[PDB]
Amino acid sequence: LITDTLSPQAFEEALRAKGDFYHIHHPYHIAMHNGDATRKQIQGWVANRFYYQTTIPLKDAAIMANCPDAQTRRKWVQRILDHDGSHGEDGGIEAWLRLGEAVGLSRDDLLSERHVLPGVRFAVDAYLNFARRACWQEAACSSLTELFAPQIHQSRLDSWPQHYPWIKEEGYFYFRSRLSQANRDVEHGLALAKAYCDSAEKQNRMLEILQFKLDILWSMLDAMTMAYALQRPPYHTVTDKAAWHTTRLVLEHH
Amino acid sequence: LITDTLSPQAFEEALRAKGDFYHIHHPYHIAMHNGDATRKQIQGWVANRFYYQTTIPLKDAAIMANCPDAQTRRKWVQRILDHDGSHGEDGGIEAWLRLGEAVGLSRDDLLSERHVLPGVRFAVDAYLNFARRACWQEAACSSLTELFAPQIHQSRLDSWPQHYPWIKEEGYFYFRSRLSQANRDVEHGLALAKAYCDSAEKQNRMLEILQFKLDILWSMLDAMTMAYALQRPPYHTVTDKAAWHTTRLVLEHH
Numbered sequence: 001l002i003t004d005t006l007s008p009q010a011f012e013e014a015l016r017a018k019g020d021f022y023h024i025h026h027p028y029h030i031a032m033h034n035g036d037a038t039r040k041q042i043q044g045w046v047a048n049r050f051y052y053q054t055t056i057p058l059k060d061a062a063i064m065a066n067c068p069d070a071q072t073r074r075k076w077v078q079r080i081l082d083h084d085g086s087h088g089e090d091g092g093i094e095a096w097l098r099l100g101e102a103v104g105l106s107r108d109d110l111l112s113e114r115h116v117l118p119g120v121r122f123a124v125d126a127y128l129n130f131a132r133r134a135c136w137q138e139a140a141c142s143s144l145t146e147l148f149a150p151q152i153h154q155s156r157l158d159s160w161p162q163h164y165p166w167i168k169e170e171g172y173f174y175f176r177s178r179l180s181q182a183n184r185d186v187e188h189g190l191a192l193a194k195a196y197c198d199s200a201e202k203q204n205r206m207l208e209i210l211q212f213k214l215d216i217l218w219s220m221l222d223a224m225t226m227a228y229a230l231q232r233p234p235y236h237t238v239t240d241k242a243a244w245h246t247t248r249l250v251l252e253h254h
Numbered sequence: 255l256i257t258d259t260l261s262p263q264a265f266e267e268a269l270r271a272k273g274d275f276y277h278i279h280h281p282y283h284i285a286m287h288n289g290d291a292t293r294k295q296i297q298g299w300v301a302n303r304f305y306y307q308t309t310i311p312l313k314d315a316a317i318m319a320n321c322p323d324a325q326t327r328r329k330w331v332q333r334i335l336d337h338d339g340s341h342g343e344d345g346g347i348e349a350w351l352r353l354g355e356a357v358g359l360s361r362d363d364l365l366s367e368r369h370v371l372p373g374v375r376f377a378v379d380a381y382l383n384f385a386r387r388a389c390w391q392e393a394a395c396s397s398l399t400e401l402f403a404p405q406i407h408q409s410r411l412d413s414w415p416q417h418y419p420w421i422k423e424e425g426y427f428y429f430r431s432r433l434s435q436a437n438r439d440v441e442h443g444l445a446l447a448k449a450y451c452d453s454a455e456k457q458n459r460m461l462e463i464l465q466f467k468l469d470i471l472w473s474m475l476d477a478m479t480m481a482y483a484l485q486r487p488p489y490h491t492v493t494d495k496a497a498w499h500t501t502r503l504v505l506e507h508h
């Protein structure tokens with residue numbers, strides 16, 4: 001807990017220390033990364049992670065709708081361009097679609113969202129809903145967990161292909177290459193947090209908002225663990241079929 | 255799937271069939287009902303279920319804010335009176351607090367919401383956010399899962415006191431009695447569904463909405479399973495203390 005307002009520098013260090021809770025320390029992430037995960041588990045990860053990615057532009061658009069500052073909006077929309085693709089070219093979403101096919105899932109499998117677990121949906125939807133309601137500074141700042149991402153790993157040829165030979169190399173490589181080409185300022189979140197949180201009370205609240213964001217990523221992986229690692233998907237005691245809801249009910253009729 | 259529009263009485267039977275997916279069929283509920291749950295699992299269940307219970311009034315008020323029909327609102331508001339108490343009298347929320355005391359938790363433990371798991375929080379908040387955005391008819395109809403609740407928590411000595419004699423008898427009896435006195439019309443959502451859902455398209459959508467409501471309840475028990483039955487609470491690889499966010503960010507500063 002903070003009593004005396006931290007300085008921009010020490011506040012940056014309180015923010016970065018939340019990195020210890022990043023989802024890379026989740027066992028499901030670790031099993032995947034070590035080559036220990038099964039085919040079902042990989043495919044389930046890609047299909048559920050896909051839901052988080054197709055929601056990010058809705059979430060960025062929500063922030064912009066709450067942002068009366070044109071200069072901020074000019075930087076922020078690059079996040080939407082990134083995912084959706086612009087100038088008639090392909091974007092991040094197309095990268096994730098290429099990974100799906102590389103791991104053996106079809107375009108329609110991913111796009112339909114049919115394999116997305118309720119637990120994943122609720123966590124991801126919490127992110128969107130926070131961005132719809134919170135002030136734009138607070139919602140924008142929550143994007144700074146992106147600073148905890150790996151080294152953009154490539155000194156690892158012994159990492160995925162190697163570990164999972166059944167994954168098609170063409171697709172995987174298109175995925176890694178579309179993503180290393182992002183144009184969004186991954187730092188904007190931190191710069192904004194440093195400028196905006198200029199009192200003890202805001203700084204403490206921002207650390208809680210960061211915690212919320214981390215709780216979302218971790219909770220996505222809990223849901224995957226239950227379903228694909230522990231044999232306990234929703235309703236397993238009553239049916240062997242997938243029976244969870246499959247619709248973004250508030251945004252689409254059917 | 256529904257092909258051609260079902261009659262009201264036949265549509266009712268399709269809604270009732272979804273009770274096969276009610277949360278009483280979840281392993282965590284079964285273990286509690288069977289006498290095999292631990293004290294930590296029971297305490298964790300009361301604390302997390304209490305987050306759901308304190309949210310119901312907010313969700314019912316969100317329905318009312320979207321309902322321009324006075325006649326509906328006069329029935330709906332009794333749900334709020336049931337939960338919060340009226341004319342000085344106590345209400346269902348006080349019954350849950352007594353249940354918490356009865357299983358060994360303090361009122362501050364419950365009221366503070368500090369033990370609520372993020373996975374429970376995200377599922378419960380998805381309910382409130384659906385009610386805030388969906389048309390009032392669709393949001394109201396989801397309350398019909400209350401029809402699936404068994405004989406209002408009562409059986410010939412098979413219960414909780416014989417399996418868990420450490421449960422305090424005063425609190426427990428206050429809980430069972432105080433909940434039996436609710437005045438809300440639990441059928442209201444089912445009567446509105448039969449009147450409102452008068453096409454195949456509405457019927458199928460309503461079935462998906464009920465499924466969404468069922469997925470909430472199941473997903474709350476998944477998160478409790480992960481924390482209290484499988485020793486995998488959030489961040490268990492990095493810390494043994496509780497580090498999840500504990501604040502309803504969009505409704506309270508701290």
